[PDB]
Design a protein around this nucleic acid. Structure first.
Lengths: 94, 75, 72, 136
RNA sequence: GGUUCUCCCCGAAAGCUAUUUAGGUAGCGCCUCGUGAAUUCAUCUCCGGGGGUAGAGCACUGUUUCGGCAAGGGGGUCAUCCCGACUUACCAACCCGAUGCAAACUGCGAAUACCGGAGAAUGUUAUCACGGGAGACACACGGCGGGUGCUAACGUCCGUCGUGAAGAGGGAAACAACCCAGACCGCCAGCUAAGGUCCCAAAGUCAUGGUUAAGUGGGAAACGAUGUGGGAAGGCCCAGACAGCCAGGAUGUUGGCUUAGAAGCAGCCAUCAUUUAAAGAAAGCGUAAUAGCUCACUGGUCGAGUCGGCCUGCGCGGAAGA
RNA sequence: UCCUCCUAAAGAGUAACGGAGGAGCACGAAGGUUGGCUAAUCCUGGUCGGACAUCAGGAGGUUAGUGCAAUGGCAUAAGCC
RNA sequence: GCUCAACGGAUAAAAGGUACUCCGGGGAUAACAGGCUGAUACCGCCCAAGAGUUCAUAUCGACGGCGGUGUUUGGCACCUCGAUGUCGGCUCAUCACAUCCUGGGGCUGAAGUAGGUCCCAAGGGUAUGGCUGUUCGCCAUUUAAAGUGGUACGCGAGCUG
RNA sequence: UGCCUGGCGGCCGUAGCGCGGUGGUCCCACCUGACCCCAUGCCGAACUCAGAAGUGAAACGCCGUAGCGCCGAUGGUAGUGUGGGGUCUCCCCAUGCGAGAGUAGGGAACUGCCAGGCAA
């Protein structure tokens, strides 16, 4: 049931990124070493209400971008300092 | 009790990269030896790297221990 | 310092305009014992309060020792 | 009172307090108190806070104090004119940037630990909160 | 202290250095006038450069928390000659793994600033040198970086810029120093900046969707709460919940305090076992203690949404002067 | 008065009765040159010898040394003979 | 040949008192008073170990925290040095409310009387003496109570000294 | 030219340590001898000379191994120039510049000029 619907980021940069986080959309990345690194924007609430389970940091996740059923694993995640929110997740493409 | 201090003695670089200097112009008033003499420059007693000839000043980072050299590209 | 009735007033003595309008004299009254210590030496109240606490120290400490000494 | 034994220099500059924190994740126990606000924990405040947590659990648990003062804050003596040199060292403080984990325990039930930090939090100046161990 | 007629042009500084010097004066920076000179000089784009600050980090200088390993140190059991026999509810360096902190720490390192070179546009040579004439060397506040001070002061001391000084005009009721903006003169003409458009007072009782009940807006915090709106998620749930209303809520067990005592009840232990639609050897009151009365939990009943957290907009109390 | 660091905002400069330390000399070799060489601190073994002389080996890597304070520098040694 | 170290060195050569004072100047620079601030002072508030036989919150409240007032001592020198006369008493006042009495309520470790504490309340009232220059305070004796403060720590073109 | 070896460099940890294996006809190292040219603050250990019967252990060079060191994106975050705003002891917005640390991963070098050996 770990299917995340997300899109492709078109505007990168600190300005662009912070503007997104203030609209319940946080940026994430996908790198696996055998493809081009893909800049992905996910929905905040769904992922926040998903990471609470242990299965999120170990299992093979299925991020859906443009129809593609890519199988990734969550490697690193940068949390917000004090507010219980997220800022960036490092999805290692496995 | 404190308040004693010495009048600063104007250290640092005097002619930066790309400068065209004449023979004898002081390039760096180095206290230690942070910059080592490369080509066409001499190291004075105050470790003052001065232009032994004239031309164009060019910095380098060669040497087996990564130490900055100051050599002059002859015109 | 929770039962120490501390008062302050215009110090009585020589000086000038300063001494007429300066609460530079302190009195420490200790409620459990009922001992009084007046002091007006320095200009600053705090320098004066320093001497005040010092003398009151001696007082209660020494009286309690004398009490035990006499009782023994 | 958690004072640095044998410091390098007696007195040091005031200095500003900006940016965010570093010790963000619960890294020793299972429950931690992270400070949200910004400010400065004086030495005796930590000691006071430590006693509060200890009696909350009565005996058990392992309390880890994450922060340590190390910065001397001086004070000028009462009724003294400006200048004349810097004041004497009085009490030690710890700059707490927003998002810094202060204390963290382990070996107690979650609910009982929730009781523990509220006693401590009242005895600290800056606004705090409660955070659990992140799997990461 | 005072220094008397008019217009036109340009226009400072309150800084450094030294001074029996600190309210004075001299040199230089800044001002003016004159002469003479090079795309000299300024902005931007590109290129060549060095830096070690903000940040970050802990190999170093120091500092610090916990865990593992662990010489030596402490109390003891002994040959109370020892050699070094045996333990230990202990402390603990060097090491190894993990987390922090620094103006006088740096294996890293920006943005700007600064120096040079090249190339366009623009600027009544704005630059430099020489000579005539000065004034000034008490600065003030605001923004940003800082020492000091209590991260107090319309405080003080520097750096950098802005305005005031030496600048009126409009706004912030009034208000040098804040915002907007540089008055050559006249005009009963027009468009705008800041800030405003119910009325004093010029201009929308304008249009659209929401929020607040307190005159908030129109002074302030820790902390407190079924104030109220929005969002996401979770628990239980017409195999009938939540709240009321009917019963039980006990048996071994005054369970072993130090058998005088805390009988589910102070500093005492452990969290037993039956009956089951159900009941904790427990949440309070009361007794030396009991007695006594409740709640958890559990059945019938009426019968539908209810409960507690989390993210946040706007409020309320916390709030007492002459 | 003079010197070093910091405050000092990464060129230079920059104040306070701001935070920390020094100097008013030394040397005929401690200068010049040529040639040569290398530390500290621990461990193991070893006569008196011991935590701590000298000897041999090892780990170590400039934590040393620099006539004197601090910073920068130094094995091409500026350190040692 | 110079600790000419007050180190750009006035002389080769020099210490103090002035309340007997005098002159030129300064609010550039102090003391009284005002302003900014609130370290200190005073008052309120949060948490709760614990005391209170039992019981944290009748009443107190450790280790700690956040505030309010501008009454104390101070900080800073912004106004005045071609003058702003200051202590205390006397006389006369006036306001604020953190209330001393009187009035109305809560709780109580409130039987009753008499009290502890908190809330609302500023209409009125709120001593006489001995001592000291006294403010303050102690003491005597009252009273329903002998309030705490602002007002140039009210008030000298009204007084006293 | 191909493979080894020696010298002198460029560049300077992706080029350095550790573990295991391997090379002697040449080359190199250890070695044999030492009265004399020389040398030991004692000693042919080191330096130097006259040689080379022996060995490839050590040393050196090469090959493999990633266990350390090192290198290192993309994205995000810290900071910040300039212009605005606020609950303005601090942060946010527009906009340009944009790290450190960490993650994927890279990686046990490359190469120049001469002189010999051995083949081609």
């Amino acid at each position: 049931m770990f299917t995340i619907n997300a899109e492709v980021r078109k505007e990168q940069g600190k300005g662009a990124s912070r503007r997104l986080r203030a609209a319940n959309k946080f940026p994430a990345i996908i790198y696996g070493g055998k493809e081009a690194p893909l800049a992905i924007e996910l929905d905040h609430d769904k992922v926040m209400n998903m990471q609470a389970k242990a299965e999120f940091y170990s299992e093979v996740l299925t991020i859906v971008v443009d129809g593609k059923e890519i199988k990734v694993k969550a490697q690193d995640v940068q949390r917000h300092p004090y507010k219980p929110k997220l800022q960036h997740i490092d999805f290692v493409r496995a | 009790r404190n308040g004693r201090d010495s009048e600063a003695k104007r250290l640092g670089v005097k002619r930066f990269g790309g400068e065209s200097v004449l023979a004898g112009s002081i390039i760096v008033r180095q206290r230690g030896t942070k910059f080592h003499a490369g080509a066409n420059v001499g190291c004075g007693r105050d470790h003052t790297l001065f232009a032994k000839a004239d031309g164009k000043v060019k910095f380098e980072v060669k040497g087996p221990k990564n130490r900055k050299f100051i050599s002059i590209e002859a015109e | 310092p929770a039962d120490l009735r501390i008062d302050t007033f215009r110090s009585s003595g020589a000086g000038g305009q300063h001494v007429n309008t300066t609460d530079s004299a302190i009195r420490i009254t200790h409620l459990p014992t009922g001992i009084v210590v007046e002091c007006q030496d320095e200009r600053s109240q705090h320098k004066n309060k320093a001497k005040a606490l010092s003398v009151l120290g001696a007082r209660i400490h020494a009286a309690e020792m004398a009490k035990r000494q006499q009782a023994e | 009172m958690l004072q640095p034994k044998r410091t390098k220099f007696r007195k040091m500059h005031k200095g500003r307090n900006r940016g965010l924190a570093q010790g963000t994740d619960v890294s020793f126990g299972s429950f931690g108190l992270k400070a949200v606000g910004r400010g400065r924990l004086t030495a005796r405040q930590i000691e006071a806070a430590r006693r509060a947590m200890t009696r909350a659990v009565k005996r058990q648990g392992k309390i880890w104090i994450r922060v340590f003062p190390d910065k001397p804050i001086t004070e000028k003596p009462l009724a003294v004119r400006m200048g004349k040199g810097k004041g004497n060292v009085e009490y030690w403080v710890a700059l707490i940037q927003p998002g810094k984990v202060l204390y963290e325990m382990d070996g107690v039930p979650e609910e009982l630990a929730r009781e523990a930090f509220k006693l401590a939090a009242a005895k600290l100046p800056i606004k705090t909160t409660f955070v659990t161990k992140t799997v990461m």
